[PDB]
Design an enzyme around this catalytic site. Structure first.
Site, short mmCIF file in Angstrom:
data_model
loop_
_atom_site.label_atom_id
_atom_site.label_comp_id
_atom_site.label_asym_id
_atom_site.label_seq_id
_atom_site.Cartn_x
_atom_site.Cartn_y
_atom_site.Cartn_z
N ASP A 184 0.83 -1.20 0.00
CA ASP A 184 0.00 0.00 0.00
C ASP A 184 0.87 1.25 0.00
OD1 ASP A 184 -2.99 0.84 1.96
OD2 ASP A 184 -1.84 2.03 0.50
N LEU A 185 0.86 1.98 -1.11
CA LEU A 185 1.69 3.18 -1.24
C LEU A 185 1.15 4.37 -0.48
CD1 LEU A 185 2.84 3.07 -4.95
CD2 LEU A 185 3.91 2.19 -2.91
N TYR A 238 -0.73 9.94 -5.12
CA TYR A 238 -0.70 11.11 -6.01
C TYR A 238 0.27 12.17 -5.51
CZ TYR A 238 -4.98 9.25 -8.23
OH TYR A 238 -5.92 8.46 -8.85
N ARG A 273 -0.92 16.66 6.21
CA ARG A 273 -1.82 15.82 6.98
C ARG A 273 -1.61 16.09 8.46
NH1 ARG A 273 -1.91 9.73 5.11
NH2 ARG A 273 -2.34 11.01 3.25
N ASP A 309 -3.14 2.42 -6.16
CA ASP A 309 -2.09 2.38 -5.17
C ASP A 309 -1.89 1.13 -4.33
OD1 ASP A 309 -4.15 2.72 -3.21
OD2 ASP A 309 -3.82 4.89 -3.10
N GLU A 310 -2.65 0.08 -4.61
CA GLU A 310 -2.51 -1.16 -3.85
C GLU A 310 -2.33 -2.40 -4.72
OE1 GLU A 310 -5.61 -1.61 -0.74
OE2 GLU A 310 -5.60 0.56 -0.45
#
Length: 372
Positions: free
Chosen positions: A9-10, A14, A46, A101-102
């Site tokens: 999982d990146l 984006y 974040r 992304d996974e």
DNA sequence: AGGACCC
DNA sequence: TGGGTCCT
């Protein structure tokens, strides 16, 4: 019998791509925007409150400094996404994509080959790479522990490769099936990896706060389970099979109840090339039902260049739309039709080809499917 | 054609 | 609320 699955999982995908494009964006809070939304942002931003899928306003009134890059054109994200998958396929051919992304990789065969190479001695030196969920103690004489540990080693090799060859960071989760691998990959969130030993499966499953959190149980099913009084993972585990079977279907019912116990026998499926290509666009309700098809000509433009590149040719086209009014939590329409064998081998024809399908009918998207 | 589910 | 996959 027993499998070793890894879930890759990146981190804020984006954002990572946008940060790699313009380095000056690093360290500075970055948010990727599509229309009026911030789909994703780097960890810095974040840290300042910015959350995934948050209105720009609520995003700036929470971080009046946030930088924004437009991410409506998925071209570069999509391209990097495939480079990641291809890099993973090199380790082992059976790789399943889940979004851009996974990825899931079945490491079972690879783990066996590696173990068979070790000698009756160095097998006692086998160590873990990364975190062990719930700080569980390893038992080197448990063949299942040894396998998952080797699995953690491969996972570390994969993440190192993604970083060295592609410049991307990410998380990985190693477990006996897809459900668990995906649930454990996110335990230590930023650019890290975790492995789940069998004895801790219940702890992981019960760590969830609602059935909705279980992969395989969507918005719908959740509400159904709720109306039945099922809210926690243990509620689902202890609910009556019969009633559940008699209200969600024997298929859905028996499957999601297995999941509540951390059981999931679904195989990792080889994704291979895309089964379809499409581009969308949502307007501020600016399509007069006519003439606004010049937009459809734009979608087709890029698509045609994409459908091309791939090599294979599509034998089906489609057009989807939307309509503004009340709170239609779900409303799409589409006219599917075959593509002229002659036109397959350029816009002009296809233009009015979609134009007829047009009349037969806030968003507009063309989809080229049924590839051969 | 439309629906459910996922990132 | 920009894409995708598989099932009815």
């Amino acid at each position: 019998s027993s499998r070793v699955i890894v879930h890759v999982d990146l981190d804020c995908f984006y954002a990572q791509v946008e940060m790699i494009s313009n380095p000056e964006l690093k360290d500075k809070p970055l948010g990727v925007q599509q229309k009026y939304l911030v789909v994703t942002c780097n960890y810095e931003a974040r840290k300042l409150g910015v959350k995934k899928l948050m209105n720009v306003r609520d995003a700036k009134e929470k971080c009046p400094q946030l930088v924004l890059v437009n991410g409506e054109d998925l071209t570069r994200y999509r391209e990097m996404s495939y480079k990641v998958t291809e890099l993973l396929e090199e380790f082992s051919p059976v790789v399943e994509r889940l979004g851009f992304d996974e990825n899931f990789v079945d490491l079972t065969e690879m783990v066996e080959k590696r173990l068979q190479q070790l000698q009756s001695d160095e097998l006692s030196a086998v160590t873990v790479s990364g975190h062990v969920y719930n700080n569980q103690s390893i038992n080197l004489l448990d063949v299942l522990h040894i396998r998952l540990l080797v699995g953690s080693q491969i996972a570390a090799e994969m993440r190192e490769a993604m970083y060295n060859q592609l410049g991307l960071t990410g998380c990985a989760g190693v477990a006996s099936n897809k459900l668990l691998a995906k649930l454990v990959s996110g335990v230590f969130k930023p650019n890290q990896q975790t492995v789940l030993l069998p004895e801790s499966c219940q702890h992981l499953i019960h760590s969830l706060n609602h059935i909705k959190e279980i992969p395989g149980i969507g918005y719908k099913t959740a509400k159904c389970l709720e109306a039945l009084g099922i809210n926690s993972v243990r509620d689902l585990q202890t609910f009556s099979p019969k009633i559940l079977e008699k209200e969600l279907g024997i298929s859905v019912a028996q499957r999601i109840q297995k999941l509540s116990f951390g059981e999931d026998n679904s195989p990792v499926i080889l994704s291979g090339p895309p089964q379809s290509f499409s581009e969308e666009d949502s307007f501020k309700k600016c399509s007069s039902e006519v003439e606004a098809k010049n937009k459809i000509e734009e979608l087709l433009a890029s698509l045609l260049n994409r459908v091309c590149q791939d090599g294979r040719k599509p034998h089906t086209v489609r057009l989807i739309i939307r309509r503004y009014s009340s709170e239609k939590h779900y409303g799409r329409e589409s006219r599917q039709c075959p593509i002229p064998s002659h036109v397959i081998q350029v816009m002009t024809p296809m233009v009015d080809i979609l134009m007829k399908l047009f009349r037969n009918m806030t968003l507009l998207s063309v989809c080229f499917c049924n590839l051969k």
